[PDB]
Structure formats: structure tokens, C-alpha cells
Design a protein around this ligand. Sequence first.
Ligand SMILES: [Mg+2]
Ligand SMILES: [Mg+2]
Ligand SMILES: [Mg+2]
Ligand SMILES: [Mg+2]
Ligand SMILES: [Mg+2]
Ligand SMILES: [Mg+2]
Ligand SMILES: [Mg+2]
Ligand SMILES: [Mg+2]
Ligand SMILES: [Mg+2]
Ligand SMILES: [Mg+2]
Ligand SMILES: [Mg+2]
Ligand SMILES: [Mg+2]
Ligand SMILES: [Mg+2]
Ligand SMILES: [Mg+2]
Ligand SMILES: [Mg+2]
Ligand SMILES: [Mg+2]
Ligand SMILES: [Mg+2]
Ligand SMILES: [Mg+2]
Ligand SMILES: [Mg+2]
Ligand SMILES: [Mg+2]
Ligand SMILES: [Mg+2]
Ligand SMILES: [Mg+2]
Ligand SMILES: [Mg+2]
Ligand SMILES: [Mg+2]
Ligand SMILES: [Mg+2]
Ligand SMILES: [Mg+2]
Ligand SMILES: [Mg+2]
Ligand SMILES: [Mg+2]
Ligand SMILES: [Mg+2]
Ligand SMILES: [Mg+2]
Ligand SMILES: [Mg+2]
Ligand SMILES: [Mg+2]
Ligand SMILES: [Mg+2]
Ligand SMILES: [Mg+2]
Ligand SMILES: [Mg+2]
Ligand SMILES: [Mg+2]
Ligand SMILES: [Mg+2]
Ligand SMILES: [Mg+2]
Ligand SMILES: [Mg+2]
Ligand SMILES: [Mg+2]
Ligand SMILES: [Mg+2]
Ligand SMILES: [Zn+2]
Lengths: 155, 87, 144, 81, 150, 129
Amino acid sequence: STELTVQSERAFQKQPHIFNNPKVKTSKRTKRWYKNAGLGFKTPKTAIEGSYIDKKCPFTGLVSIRGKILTGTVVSTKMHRTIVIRRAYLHYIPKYNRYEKRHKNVPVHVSPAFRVQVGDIVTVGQCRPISKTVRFNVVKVSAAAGKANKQFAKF
Amino acid sequence: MENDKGQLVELYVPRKCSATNRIIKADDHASVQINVAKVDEEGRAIPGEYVTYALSGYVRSRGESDDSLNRLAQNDGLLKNVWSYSR
Amino acid sequence: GKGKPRGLNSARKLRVHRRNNRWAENNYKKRLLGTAFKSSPFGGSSHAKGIVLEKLGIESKQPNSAIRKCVRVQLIKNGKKVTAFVPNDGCLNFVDENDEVLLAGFGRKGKAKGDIPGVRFKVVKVSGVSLLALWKEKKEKPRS
Amino acid sequence: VLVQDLLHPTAASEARKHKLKTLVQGPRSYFLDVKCPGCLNITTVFSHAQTAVTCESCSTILCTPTGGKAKLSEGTSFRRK
Amino acid sequence: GRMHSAGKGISSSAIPYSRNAPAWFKLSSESVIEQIVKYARKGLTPSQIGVLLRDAHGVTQARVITGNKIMRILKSNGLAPEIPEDLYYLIKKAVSVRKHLERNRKDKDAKFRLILIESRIHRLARYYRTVAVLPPNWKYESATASALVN
Amino acid sequence: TRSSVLADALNAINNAEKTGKRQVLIRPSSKVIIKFLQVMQKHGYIGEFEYIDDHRSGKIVVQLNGRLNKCGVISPRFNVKIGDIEKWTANLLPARQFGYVILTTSAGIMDHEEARRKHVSGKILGFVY
RNA sequence: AGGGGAUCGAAGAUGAUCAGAUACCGUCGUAGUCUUAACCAUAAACUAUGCCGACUAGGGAUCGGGUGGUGUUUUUUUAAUGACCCACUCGGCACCUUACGAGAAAUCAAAGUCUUUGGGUUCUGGGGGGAGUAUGGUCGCAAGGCUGAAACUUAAAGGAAUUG
RNA sequence: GCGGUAAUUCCAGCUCCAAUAGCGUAUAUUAAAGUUGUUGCAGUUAAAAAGCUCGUAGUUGAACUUUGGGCCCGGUUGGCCGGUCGGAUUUCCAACGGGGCCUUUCCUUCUGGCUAACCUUGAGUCCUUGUGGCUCUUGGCGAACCAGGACUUUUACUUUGAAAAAAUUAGAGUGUUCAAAGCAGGCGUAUUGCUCGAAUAUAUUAGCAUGGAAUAAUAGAAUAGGACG
RNA sequence: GGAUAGUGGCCUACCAUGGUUUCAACGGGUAACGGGGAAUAAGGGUUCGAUUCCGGAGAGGGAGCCUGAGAAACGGCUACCA
Ligand SMILES: [Mg+2]
Ligand SMILES: [Mg+2]
Ligand SMILES: [Mg+2]
Ligand SMILES: [Mg+2]
Ligand SMILES: [Mg+2]
Ligand SMILES: [Mg+2]
Ligand SMILES: [Mg+2]
Ligand SMILES: [Mg+2]
Ligand SMILES: [Mg+2]
Ligand SMILES: [Mg+2]
Ligand SMILES: [Mg+2]
Ligand SMILES: [Mg+2]
Ligand SMILES: [Mg+2]
Ligand SMILES: [Mg+2]
Ligand SMILES: [Mg+2]
Ligand SMILES: [Mg+2]
Ligand SMILES: [Mg+2]
Ligand SMILES: [Mg+2]
Ligand SMILES: [Mg+2]
Ligand SMILES: [Mg+2]
Ligand SMILES: [Mg+2]
Ligand SMILES: [Mg+2]
Ligand SMILES: [Mg+2]
Ligand SMILES: [Mg+2]
Ligand SMILES: [Mg+2]
Ligand SMILES: [Mg+2]
Ligand SMILES: [Mg+2]
Ligand SMILES: [Mg+2]
Ligand SMILES: [Mg+2]
Ligand SMILES: [Mg+2]
Ligand SMILES: [Mg+2]
Ligand SMILES: [Mg+2]
Ligand SMILES: [Mg+2]
Ligand SMILES: [Mg+2]
Ligand SMILES: [Mg+2]
Ligand SMILES: [Mg+2]
Ligand SMILES: [Mg+2]
Ligand SMILES: [Mg+2]
Ligand SMILES: [Mg+2]
Ligand SMILES: [Mg+2]
Ligand SMILES: [Mg+2]
Ligand SMILES: [Zn+2]
């Protein structure tokens, strides 16, 4: 999320150990740092362009993505800098030789590099424990808006 | 119904209703077999020479015994225009 | 198809219906309600040892006409009182109220046996010496 | 029955069936060119109008709707094409 | 069939096998497209236009002479109504039924048929809402429907 | 509403032979029906069929002889792992020698014995004998 | 809760019958029956038979719509009409005969196209009593509705048909 | 169901049956049970279709979008032959599979590394009247995957494979005297060792890896805010 | 930020209002340690596994802690309850 005035906390936000010497008159005004997550996941330009300060970002922060990579559809965007996705799957009962619809919701951190809204399929990647429940991080958006621009007024 | 070294086993290859090509079993005492004579030059039905058709009991019960014969005897020769392939 | 959803993703509906309809199964019902533990003088066990209160002349049901010799027993582990049969002509001379008999099921899954009304148990031992043995001559009943 | 041609049905027993039960379904209505000699020009009318068709120039009449085929009005010619 | 009754009538158009011309039919796609927009300008429903062109004209069906459906012709030519006409006539009837019911609270039968009409209304709307032709919040409201049609 | 277009095709054919007929009109002629009809005539349980072309889903006319006992469809197109095809043929085929269960694999719609040759599997469609 | 209260009439009172006769039959007649405003939500609410779709068999009636006519009748001057007749075709309520088929049978064009067992889907039942009882929940002004056990008991209960 | 005075059921004698170092009983559970029915039940009247209709969740859901034809490579059974001192491969033949092509035909995609295969051919030719045959460099095949950049509609199913404890199970070898077992053992110069073993299979949901592209979903270009350069 | 060997509402402060659910959350029951496995032999299943191996938990019931690489140890200590 984080929207407008990154310096909005009691503690000054900053990237760790990314020093900017004031004696040397610079034009970028803040030496910024970013990494490439890996597995061919494009580190989106908004992470390099933007000036957010999220330390749980997989592109600008101090987490790493390793292990399971999962996808799922977004079902709530009501938490700040974190969402919840619904991953669906059919589960097999042998005795009847048929299936049943099951599902699990996965809480997943989302860097302000991405702008998400409910309905979007998203690719997440497992990282270290981020919070009490978050064990995945949003890493690539597969939808755009779920045909939102094609829902305008009369012709 | 052969066996390992070709020898014909399992007696009694049954008949077959020429209208349905289904089997005419033993106890099918409702079936039939119709012998048609072989007429020659100027009358003279040849005795002992037949054009035989066999019909199941199921066909004759359903009434199709008549209509099915017209079709079977016509294209086998002994009918001039009576039967119709269209309706 | 008459009822049962034949769909390939209808397993939940098919499981739950089974679950539900098992309850009409008399045995499945008892097994999950733990009836043997709740009801059923025996705690769910094969036998149960108890103590003789009084010797009863239970009169057989129709069309039979007899006096079936039985004993009212107060089970040790339970205190539950139970009237139980003493089979084998004689054998009511062996019991002698206040004694310690070993009851057993009658072999009808509850369900009192025969012309004997409301007797779901039979005696197998008294004073720890095997009713059968006393009947023949093999053992003798202990001191007191 | 029990053996017949379902591919080449006779033109009569076919013609008598319902418009949907023919071998390949098709309409049984038609169009027609109607004209009263008061005018020079013709007007193509549908056989089951539902709309009382009026002609080109004058506020005249041509036909009234019914349950089915339109009742063509007073003396007028027609042809099925 | 008959989603809201028990009748089983089979009664449809037998569309001709000939997908191209009548071939005794004259004037061009220009001729009838112009003729469609003409009636659409009067305000006729795409159905009325199709019937008025079937009888008084030689337009057996407008999809043949012109490669476009009548509703799509009005759309392109900026005559597309706010809501589809079936959902219009459903809402239209629902209002009329309701206007009758508010005047006769003793008419159990009309209260019934209202439910049947409205249930089709809500189901149709859900379809149109799924295919983006209605904003993804559109809802039929009794207190606002009579404003929507008349 | 019509659910398995294949089911209707096969039941019409079974009700045909049972009634002693030699032909049937079937509706409405999906691809899989043809691909099913074609497997039957490969092993001679029907003669030739003709696709008649309305400008709709289509119609078919099948000419059947007398060899067909019962051609059936399996309502849920169950999955069959290659170690279960024998379990299917065993349940619903009159013997080991003859009869075919026809299933649907990635390598095409094909009777079980062919599907054993190419060594591929998938969902089960129906059976012919 | 108003109004209405002719009629018939739970209740009650009677006359008779009966060993008795709180009944059947007769008399009187309260509530009710009718209506408005609100409740109640049950009937052998029945076809004791779910819905959507496919296929499978002959027959003549009738209902509604439609198509066909050098058909009949209404005459005016020939029509137009209207009613009627004949053939067809959809969709009705049914009936008749068959049974390939099904069923334990009675019977059933579905209750058929099932051990050659799979079109989609909903609901209920699992020996008889106990018992639609106890308990809790919930709805109702009430009466009661819906949801709804167990212990114990029991070898039968039951269905259709056959002979008596 | 027997027993109320000739008891084929009780109490015994006699004789007889069944299983037998074992046999009965009680309780539980499994089979019989298609009386829990996915396979596979029943519901007119035997137990069972809600009084009726709407209807959300659930389950389900019409048809149609590269088919058809042509060429090539090399596999595994089976035949008619056996060349050879039980088994062998060529040529002749079918039969059933796999790979790759050209038919308007993404194979994600460019930038080199590499080339295995020929439109190649540079000479001819072991040799059956020669396209039977391969060693063989100087113009001319991409995909066979490396690695670096740039991107990718989603799934279900099925194939194969990796990853995988032992005991248990199924199962091989082996004469614990047999067998349940065990994992031994078997050969000699049995006076200074020889030597076979201690297999194989199942390991099913999920996850990983790979081939397939039927069946069944999903997404796309309609106020063009489209597609390539 | 503190605390931990370290991640983490693990704890604190500040701020926000979120998190789960008929695809059954939450609650109740279990005469419930989980698994390799066991019994029953057409198949599909049904029932069982305290118990020879693996994993977990405990040491009368709770809590606390010393030593130490490793214990919240009990044939270690301290306290309360029995
Ligand atoms: Mg928040
Ligand atoms: Mg019940
Ligand atoms: Mg007593
Ligand atoms: Mg409906
Ligand atoms: Mg009805
Ligand atoms: Mg219909
Ligand atoms: Mg209509
Ligand atoms: Mg009155
Ligand atoms: Mg009285
Ligand atoms: Mg009196
Ligand atoms: Mg009284
Ligand atoms: Mg009722
Ligand atoms: Mg009735
Ligand atoms: Mg009929
Ligand atoms: Mg009969
Ligand atoms: Mg008795
Ligand atoms: Mg005597
Ligand atoms: Mg005697
Ligand atoms: Mg005697
Ligand atoms: Mg035994
Ligand atoms: Mg199955
Ligand atoms: Mg039953
Ligand atoms: Mg009854
Ligand atoms: Mg009943
Ligand atoms: Mg009913
Ligand atoms: Mg309801
Ligand atoms: Mg489909
Ligand atoms: Mg595998
Ligand atoms: Mg925090
Ligand atoms: Mg709150
Ligand atoms: Mg549940
Ligand atoms: Mg426990
Ligand atoms: Mg357990
Ligand atoms: Mg069972
Ligand atoms: Mg255990
Ligand atoms: Mg225990
Ligand atoms: Mg411990
Ligand atoms: Mg102790
Ligand atoms: Mg301790
Ligand atoms: Mg100790
Ligand atoms: Mg210890
Ligand atoms: Zn005019």
C-alpha cells in the first residue's frame, strides 16, 4: 500500500546501510538499492522507480524467496501492505472415485511495487516467516484488472 | 468356435433370422423358415430346389413378418415393384 | 438416475449422505453412541462378576409352562442389579444367596433368550469353581 | 417400418410433417408481391404479416393479421417469389 | 423447458438453410441498413424493426442481406439503448404488475406472478452483469424500476 | 436439459437393434459421437453412417446390422490409470476374448485394446458389444 | 377485533330406541357457517407415483392454435363470412388394444429402454413396537407447527395374489 | 420349537456323528450384506417423493475452431526359411507400435557456442549388368541444449521417471531331517581354500520431473483503449 | 524496539481494523497418541492399530529452575496441591 508520504512513521524509514553523503551534492537525492529476486521473475520498474521503504519487499527489501512458488486469486485487499489469496483445488475421495471442491486462504505480503485489487490472479513466493501468518510474498501479477476498463457508461 | 490346434469344437452353429441377423435359438418355436419354389421355363416349379428365408419369432410377433419378406424376396429376385424403400 | 448425484465432483455430497444414512444402521448407531458403556449392565465387556441377592422362580413365557431358576445379581464394578439364569437341571442348589457368581451374556446380542422374560445373562461360575464342573462332579464348591 | 430410408423420405410424408420434424428444418411461409390496380408499383409482403401492411404512397390497406397467414385485403393479385 | 411454468410447447422459427441471398431480393446492404437506422430513429425496438422489415419490406432476416444483427447495427450507429430490451420488457411488466398489486392487495395471484417475473429479471440481469453489458453493481429495485422505464 | 449428447446417440442405437430395426436417426451429432460411431464400425458392430448437415448441431443416420448386443456410455467420464483398464473391461464386458471398452486418451479416442498397444490412458467413454 | 348472523348446525337440553344408549333417528339450539383486518400452516393437501432431457407401439374420440378445399349448409346475385365435414400438424385432459418390455403380484407406454446394472439433479426409507413419545431448540395469542431421540421390548409385522 | 405317561429335543445307558491335543461358551468385529448400494439398493400399494411454486449455496449443463492426403528414418514380436557346431542375423512377407517431414501450418524469442544430420560432392568405388555401401574435406539444415538478454493466459486429466527405511505383504534362490521359520549356504586337495548369495515387486493422495494435447474448464478484438514493424 | 541461538504478535509501544466460515468456521464428543501396519480373502469395501520399528508426549498433579553442548530433566533441585 503505503500511498503518499513514505516518511509517515515515528521512526525515520531508510534502507539499511545505504548511505548518502550530504557533502557530495547529488541529483538522485537518495542512493537506492534493489535486487533481482530470481527464477526469471521480473523485478518490476515501480520497485526501482518508486521511493517506498518496505523492508519485506522481495525486490528492495531484506527477504529472500525460496522453496514453494504458488499462484492464487486475490480475495481480500483490506490489510495494509498485505493481502489474502484463495487457492482452490479438487480433492479426491477414492471410495467414490470422484472429487470435491476444497480451498485454503494464504495470507501473503505484497510490496507497494504492485498495485493489486480483488479478483487478480497473483504469483506468490515462499519466504521466511514475515508475520504470525504470512509465509509467502507477492512476486508477479498475472491478471490486470479483470476487464475493468470494459465496464464504462453508455455508448 | 475353434480350439488350440484349429479343431472345430462346441457343436451346433445355430441358424439366423435373415430379417434381423439375430440367432434363432432352439426353443424359439415361434420362428419360421419359408421355402420358395424355383420355377423354370413356362411354369414347372422345380421340386427339391428352394430359395429359403428364415424369420425369428420376434419378427413375426411384431407383425413385420410380411413386410420383411417383401424386402427380402424382392432384391433376391421374386418381386416386381411391390416393396418400397421409401415412405 | 434416481437420486444419487452421478457427477464427477459430487463426492462431498456422496460422502455426507452415507455418513447421514449410516445412522439408520442399528449397529453403527450403538457403536458411536457408546451404548455398551452408557447402557448395558456389563461395562461393554464379555463377562461381569457380581453377587447374589435372592433366588427367583421366573415363570416361563407362553406357550411354555415352567419355573426357570434365576438369581438377582449386583455387579461388582457397577452396583447395577441384574436377574440372571442358572441353567442345567439342578444348579440352583449351588448358588446360595450372598455368593459371588460370574455372569455372562446369553448369546442374543442383548435380547433375553427364550421363554425366560427379561433375562439377558446366565451364570458361568459360582465361588470361582465353574458351574459346569459342579454339575458333573469334577470340582467341589469351596469352604464358604 | 423395421427397414426404410431415413435419408430419402418421400416428398409427401415429408411435406405433411411439422416444420421442425422435417429431415432438415425450414420455413413453410413465403413472400408475395401484392398490388391493387389503383397503383403501378408492387409491395413485397410476408405471408404472416402481424402488421397490417400499407402501401407506398397512399394511406391504403393491403391485409389484416390473423392467427396465421395474413388475410389479404380486397381484390389484389399475388405471386410466390 | 418453459423456465417458469409447466408448459412444453415447441414453437420456434424454422430458419432457412440458405444463409446467403434470397437471390430474387434486390437492393443492397446499404438499402436496408439505412432502413434499420430509420426506424431505430423513430425509437422502434430492434424486434419491431425486424418485423416491420419482414412484412412491409423484403428483409427475410437482416443477418443475411447485411452481415450484422439488428441490435449490433443500432449499437454501431449510436442507437444502443441503456439496457437490453428483454430486460426492459421484463422490468416494464414487473412495474405494471406491481402497480396492479398496490391497488389490489387482495390479489394473491398477482403477488405470485410478480415473484416469477422478478426472478427472471434478477437472473437475466446476472447474465448481462457477467458479460460486462451492465456495470458490476447493477440491481433491479422496485422503488426505482418505474423510474427506469417510464 | 440435454446433458450427454453421446448418451442419447448410444441409447437410440440400442433401442434400434432391440426393436429389430436396421437404421436410426440420431441427434445432435457431436464430434465425439462420430469418433464413437467410428470405433464401432471399425470392429463391425454397425455398418456405414451418414452425417446429414442441417445448419445446426447436425443429424446422423446409422445403418446397423445385427451383431450389436449393447453399446453403452459411462456417465461420469472417470479417470483410468493404466493399471485400472483391466478393472474396467472386467466389470462390464461379457468375456475376455471379445467386446471393447472405448475410452478417451490424449492419443485419441480408442478402444481399450488399441489403448493398450500405444500405451496411453485417460478418461473412460463407454463400451461396445 | 368489527360487521353479519337466512341456512345448516361441534356444544348443551330434550323425545324416543336400548339391559344400558352419554350415540345412531326426531326436536330445540350456543359457537360456527358469511365478510373485513390480522393470525394459524395442517388434510387419504392423492395420481398414495419428483423435476428437466432422450428413445421405444397400435387405435379411434375430444380440447386449443394453425395449414390444406373446382368439401356440405346459411342465398342476395355469385361471393365474404359464420357453423359444420374431411386430411394433416403442434400442444392439452383423458380413454381403448397390445406387449416387445417391467413387476412379488395387483398392474404399468411408464412403474419400459437395469446383473448386457451410469443422461442431469432434488428428496426420503433401512424389521416390528416403543413413538412422532421424551428432551432441547424455534414459530404461534392459543390450539398447536417444524426440528426430533433413547432405554426397554419383540420373531415377526407387512405386501400382492390363491384356495377355502 | 420340545416336555401335560409309548419324549426322534429333557435326565441317563447303549450306539452313532463332527472336529481332534485340542473342543465349547461369552463379547466384539469381518465375510455372508446388492440389509448403507461409487461399483450396487429401495421409495404406486411392503419402510420411503416435502401441499405447492420461487430460489441462493451445491451438483450439472447443446453443437462448432487442423482435419485429410504424401514422403522418409529406425525399432518388437510372428512367420517361410538356417548360415551354424539348443540359438544367430540378412534378405521376402505381413501385423502392431515410435520419431521426423511437405501439404497457407510458432517451434516463445533474438545474440554465438556445436554442429547430428544432407539439398551437399570431392575423387571414385569394395563389388552381383548399381543409388545395395561408408570411411571421406572447400559454398550449403538448426533447435539436439548449452548461457546471456528479452517474455510468457490459466487449469483438470493421463504417460513415464526421479525422490524415496527396515520388519510386514506379494515374491525369487536355498532340502531349517519336514514345516512355521532362517538368511543362509554350496563346493574341495575336508593337511594351512574354492565359491553363489543376502534378489524383484507394491510403495496409490500430495509435492517434484517428463511425454502427450482427446475429454472438461479458463482467458482474448466490440464505444477497438486491438494486432504485427 | 525488546527478548531469543535465531524467524515471528514471541513480548512491548504506537497506529490501523482486520483474521475464519455452508467448500462447515467456531463449539461439543472421542470408551483419540500419529504413522509403518492388523483382521476380513471376486472386486469396490468394512473394521482395528495401548503394544517388538519411526515420530511425539509424560514421569502423582501443576509451575519454576540449577548444571550443561544438549533438560524446562524428575532414579536433579525449589515451591504449592494431593
Ligand atoms: Mg489494516
Ligand atoms: Mg429415522
Ligand atoms: Mg427382583
Ligand atoms: Mg425451474
Ligand atoms: Mg403435476
Ligand atoms: Mg421440448
Ligand atoms: Mg410461440
Ligand atoms: Mg347463526
Ligand atoms: Mg348430546
Ligand atoms: Mg335419554
Ligand atoms: Mg355427550
Ligand atoms: Mg403432512
Ligand atoms: Mg385421491
Ligand atoms: Mg400412442
Ligand atoms: Mg401379461
Ligand atoms: Mg414362538
Ligand atoms: Mg412309564
Ligand atoms: Mg417310556
Ligand atoms: Mg423315551
Ligand atoms: Mg472351530
Ligand atoms: Mg466406479
Ligand atoms: Mg432393501
Ligand atoms: Mg397402508
Ligand atoms: Mg407406504
Ligand atoms: Mg407429492
Ligand atoms: Mg425448504
Ligand atoms: Mg460441451
Ligand atoms: Mg508414478
Ligand atoms: Mg510488528
Ligand atoms: Mg474490531
Ligand atoms: Mg457437514
Ligand atoms: Mg486418551
Ligand atoms: Mg486410532
Ligand atoms: Mg458392512
Ligand atoms: Mg500406535
Ligand atoms: Mg488406554
Ligand atoms: Mg521429558
Ligand atoms: Mg503411578
Ligand atoms: Mg520435571
Ligand atoms: Mg523410578
Ligand atoms: Mg530419566
Ligand atoms: Zn396500396
